[PDB]
Structure 1
Amino acid sequence: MVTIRLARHGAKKRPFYQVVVADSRNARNGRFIERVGFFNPIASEKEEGTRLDLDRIAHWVGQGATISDRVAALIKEVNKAA
């Protein structure tokens, strides 16, 4: 099925996660359908560090896609503060 998940990138011990509407069979860093936002867990906290696209995630959940554990938490947390 179609999912919404984090692909890892970044250097070693300093990850960085793109957020990617994939088919679930494809490998983590491989073939995605869309990119939708990002997530930096090492961020400075004076300067962004997470940005989802809530308008295009809600579209893909419409058409009937899953979400991860993490991408769920990131949606909960980017609707509290913003």
Structure 2
Amino acid sequence: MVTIRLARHGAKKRPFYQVVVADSRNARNGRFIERVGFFNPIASEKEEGTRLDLDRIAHWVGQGATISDRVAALIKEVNK
């Protein structure tokens, strides 16, 4: 059961939040199939927010994986 999701990364105080394609078996953030970018809450001196690989997500959505709502609108605002 594969899905495209915004994964919990860096937990306490300053998290990074990576976006991944992964299988719903077992763990919340265990094994993944492709890591496609980062949400990154920090804008301090940097333009490195909301990044996504538009070749890799298109190779999964509607052709093997589902998409999570917290990524389903991110795909339209990538590094905007």
Q: TM-score normalised to the size of structure 1?
A: 0.79
Deviations 1:23-69 (A, max 9, x none): 12242221111111111123326421121011110111142311111
Q: Secondary structure at the match of 2:61?
A: helix
The offset of 1:77, in angstroms, is 1.3
The offset of 1:14, in angstroms, is 1.7
Q: In structure 2, how many angstroms separate the alpha carbons of the residues matched to 1:51 and 1:74?
A: 9
The aligned length equals 80
Q: TM-score normalised to the size of structure 2?
A: 0.81
Q: In structure 2, how many angstroms separate the alpha carbons of the residues matched to 1:45 and 1:77?
A: 20
Which protein is richer in helix relative to its size? 1
Instruction: Flag as ranges the 4+ runs of structure 1 deviating above 3 A.
Output: none
Q: In structure 1, how many angstroms separate the alpha carbons of the residues matched to 2:50 and 2:38?
A: 6
Which structure 1 residue ranges, 5 or more long, are not aligned?
A: none
User: How well do the aligned residues superpose, as a CA RMSD in angstroms?
Assistant: 2.0
